[PDB]
Amino acid sequence: EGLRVVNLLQERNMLPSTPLKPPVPNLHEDIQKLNCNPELFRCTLTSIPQTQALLNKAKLPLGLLLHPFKDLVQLPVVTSSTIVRCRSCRTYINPFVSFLDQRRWKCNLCYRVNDVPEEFLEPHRRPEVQNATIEFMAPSEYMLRPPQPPVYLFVFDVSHNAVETGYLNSVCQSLLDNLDLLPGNTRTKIGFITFDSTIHFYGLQESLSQPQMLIVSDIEDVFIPMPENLLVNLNESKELVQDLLKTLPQMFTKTLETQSALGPALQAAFKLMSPTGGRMSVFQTQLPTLGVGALKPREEPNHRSSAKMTPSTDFYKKLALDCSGQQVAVDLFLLSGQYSDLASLGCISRYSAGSVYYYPSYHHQHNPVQVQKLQKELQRYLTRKIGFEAVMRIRCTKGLSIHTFHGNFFVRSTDLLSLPNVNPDAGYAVQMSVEESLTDTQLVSFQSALLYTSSKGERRIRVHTLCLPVVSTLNDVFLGADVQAISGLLANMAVDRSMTASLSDARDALVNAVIDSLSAYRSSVPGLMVPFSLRLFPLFVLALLKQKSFQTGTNARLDERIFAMCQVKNQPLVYLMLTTHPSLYRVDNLSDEGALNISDRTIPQPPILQLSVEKLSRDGAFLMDAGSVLMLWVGKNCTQNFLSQVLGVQNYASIPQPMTDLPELDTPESARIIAFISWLREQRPFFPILYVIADESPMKANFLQNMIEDRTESALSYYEFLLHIQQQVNK
């Protein structure tokens, strides 16, 4: 703990050796124990300001970051025949209500007194009041139509370049291996569309010797060629789709189609799914050039180009809104080897609650990293749970007003979010403000209700409720600041500033965010003095400015920067931090100070090191956790015991160049490092590949790009960043 002030110019070693934990709101012992899980719901200011004037003085953003559909270890399910909701604001009965008359409860969001119905009977012992995270059973009035079945329409690009990448094989092989594991019951429907210069439907009837490929060549006027066997029942046509998946990669080996009609192909797929909705999987490999939705090429920037982003057309935005209205979500798998204007294409997922996946320069032989990356990412994508035709509402106590939404969805009426699909790996963020002074109450609350249809045809509602205390001192606002949550909400705000203004203004707003807040703290108290809750604020904002989303003097390309921005706008906070500020450990000497409690496994706990080359050593090896990958860097003068007992190699020179993973040698050293690695990848549902390719000369030393504390020819160092800030705090 500590109410202590920190001088960032003297410490220079302020990153602790243990993982950061979300701050504990300054709440009573009985209220905090019932508070929502910080993974699912958290705020940038655990001590909410009382007046907007107070919030403006702090120069910090106020907002929430939520991961509402995350996989849970234990989820209470209430099957009540009546859902107790406040008669005014419709907020669900939550733990942080105020029971007074024992048959009347005061809503903690609009302060109206409501009557406890006879059924709810000790009404405070009901599970709806003992759990902030809870899932209800929606009644007959909480659905516009009967529960829609799970529909999975895959859409493949099969142009000349697509066939060269060879992506179709693993995708089809992944669908084969995960066909029985798709979420859904016997109502599950499946479909397939390939396209190039023309859209290709596929009929699947058991009365036929083989599937039939129906080609619609009218690009300017697409239609559905057959009414029955295009979206078939997976349970009944299991044998038919299997033969098609075994045949699809072999159909286009000799194609000469150099152009791809992406636009009209989605219009087709949309028409095919419009009657029901579902999940549309799109696999594109190159710039769309043929038909409506065609995009013009762009010249990629270089290190020398300044900061001078937006879509070139609104076609894919308008189509996404058409899919949203029909409860259709589009997930865009881009395996491009050249520029493809993802700034435009991405709109198909942003406004349809999908998610974009990027595999730059995919090739079944040349790039083995993207193959196994797509392999593992398809595993999760096809097996993770899913919800259909979903909406979400974010409610907050009177006085606080949400005014900006961040995430993949379409915002209907304010506070209403349309989620055609909902996946357990999407994050969302919101930015709020004090519309009326909070002189009345000393606690506030925030609630999010997720009305969705399960893969089993059951309309469910998942509700989270968070409670936070209100403060009136400037120092009390800083004491409850969540630095990681602030970095997340800032990163999201900077993406919009890039689209709305430019990359320069986005970077300026990020730097000014640290200057204006610390300058407000200095006025409120020689060196760079900061509160204990903001000691890591300039470090993380710096790492943000060196992330691929906002970096400048790097050789990064257009579709790289856009996808990094998509990950900021769609990933939970936990993984934004792991990517932006990776966790660095030394793994060539692990020992027994770990968590050797998990029965027969030790799992060493090496101390976290800061992202500076000054911490490395050519004598050892270091594992860097970037969330998505585990790049294991080996030193040139590495120890001989680590080469043979861990890498299975007799010298540094014979380390295989593309080393896709470590060998499970029978050594206690390999047993320890495999025990520590396996414990990291268990903390997440997206299996991260580990490539030790990061030698000292593999031309793949992007491991050094994540050394965000050092200087380069086009970015400040961490000490230079602190020096840049101090000059501005006391100007």
Partner: protein
Amino acid sequence: TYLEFIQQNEERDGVRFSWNVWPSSRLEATRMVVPVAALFTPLKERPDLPPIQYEPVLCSRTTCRAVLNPLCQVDYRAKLWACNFCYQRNQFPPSYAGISELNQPAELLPQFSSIEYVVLRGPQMPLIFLYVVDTCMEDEDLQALKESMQMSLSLLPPTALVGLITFGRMVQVHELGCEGISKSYVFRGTKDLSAKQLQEMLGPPPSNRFLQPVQKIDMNLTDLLGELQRDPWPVPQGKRPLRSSGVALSIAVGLLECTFPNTGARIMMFIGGPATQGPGMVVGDELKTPIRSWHDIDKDNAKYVKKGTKHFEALANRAATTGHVIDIYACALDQTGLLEMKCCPNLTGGYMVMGDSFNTSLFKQTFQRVFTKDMHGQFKMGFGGTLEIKTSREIKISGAIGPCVSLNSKGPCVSENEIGTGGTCQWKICGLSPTTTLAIYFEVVGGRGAIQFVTQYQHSSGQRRIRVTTIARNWADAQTQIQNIAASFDQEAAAILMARLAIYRAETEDVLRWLDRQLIRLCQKFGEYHKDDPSSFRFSETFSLYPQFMFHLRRSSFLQVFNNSPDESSYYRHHFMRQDLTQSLIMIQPILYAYSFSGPPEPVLLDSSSILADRILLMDTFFQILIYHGETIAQENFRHLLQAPVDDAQEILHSRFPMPRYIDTEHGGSQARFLLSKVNILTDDVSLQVFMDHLKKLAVSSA
């Protein structure tokens, strides 16, 4: 004998002229009642002529260029011959250097006045058969059509190309043999496509992905054709199926126009009902409203006929210009829209088969007549014919009537007064058989004038052949002008050549009025009579049958369209405009035979006086063979009688191409109406006796 002459000339040269002696004076040529015209069959079979495997040897004059024929004057000493049309004198080619008097070329013998040459222009293109199949029909009808198709597929040459287009609400162009998937191209049956469009949207002997050789595909096709199923779109209550035949055909035409233009190709379209969607629509989808009738089209209660016809008329010209054949096989209980689609098989040499169901012995057998082979296992059909006619300087061509399109080639042989498809010396016949007969109409502006018919076509073997027929008829001696002309009249030929004119003006509109003014004019010039005395009228044996023919013609189903459906009228006229003389006579005036104990089968008259109760009849309308059992016989000796007409029927019930509908009825049955109707304005008629009385009352009066 003038009858032996007509027979032998039709046997050798396949032609029947209305006048075998022609007027030598402008005064008689203008005052010609029945025009000078020919019933010409370019590919008539005959006692095995020797196929000439060398070049035909033309005349050396840019304008003339007539073929060497038995009418040319030859000098076997100077190796020079004189063209009989332009008098130009020609040197014999080097190939004819060793010409001898005792051994002269075939094209000079009078026996080979009609002779065929075999020429080589280059590589023989394979034949092309494009199936266009309707899927809006009952399963029994669709399965039977599938069985008929697999049968025709087995008779095709291995070199020939095949393609499948199925349709219903949508149009599917099938790409065949793509192994593991078997794909097709789907189009909307609601908007018409051009050829350039259809080429863009789709993409050693030649072959496409859609038109592949039978030998390499006959196995994947015969499995696709076996798995065909009805159009998958539902048909709600009280509605017709959405059938896009207008677009299906334009895609068939457009496909061949951009892949194999100017080559023999057969577009075989199979229909199970009317086109209810897209261009060429014949009727709406509402079953409440019936398809148009002759009454509805006369009272302006048919809003799709004109628009529908124009669409198919543009496709008929598109296919005829490109040189492809369009067949139409329609089987359905209701009408099908043949009236709007007639131009496709009429301008081309396409067939038009009609029936109630593809699941009938009537259709199945008719369809295999299409693929009947000769003494070499090759189809009795030709493709891409070009008929050029050379005439003497005194003769001009008015025009042609029959399955042909004008090539609009001008010349001194073209007449100002054009008739039918006129104003040209060349016509294109995309399809023809040994039966295809044209009607060429001529005009006159030691005697003898001559006409040369040159027909170049593609044989089903792939060879290119030139058929040259040269005929000569005497000029009328001016001291016996009308007496020689009168003796050379072919009353049968003229009757059909005049029926050819009447039906042409009717199908492209009174017509009976013209037919009666010409019957009277013919009676008043070549008949014997005293003025104002009808009893005195007689006709020579050369003319006596013309009035009876004209009697049955004006009452036939070719000029009195009412009591028939518009599809029935076009079907009747379709076949009459192609057939030779003998068959065209049978159409206008059916032949009757009598079967009783008192005598063998005998031909009788088409009069109610022949309908005996103790007698069985056998009427031969070209379209139906009927057997009538009188009220007495309608109950081993009684077996010879009941099956004598059934025996004689089967013989002719197989040679005829459109297998005539067979009927077995008796006195009192509802099917005996067809016999009582074929039996029995100016020249208003009850029966023949009254018709002749009125005819004589007008012939002997003022002219």
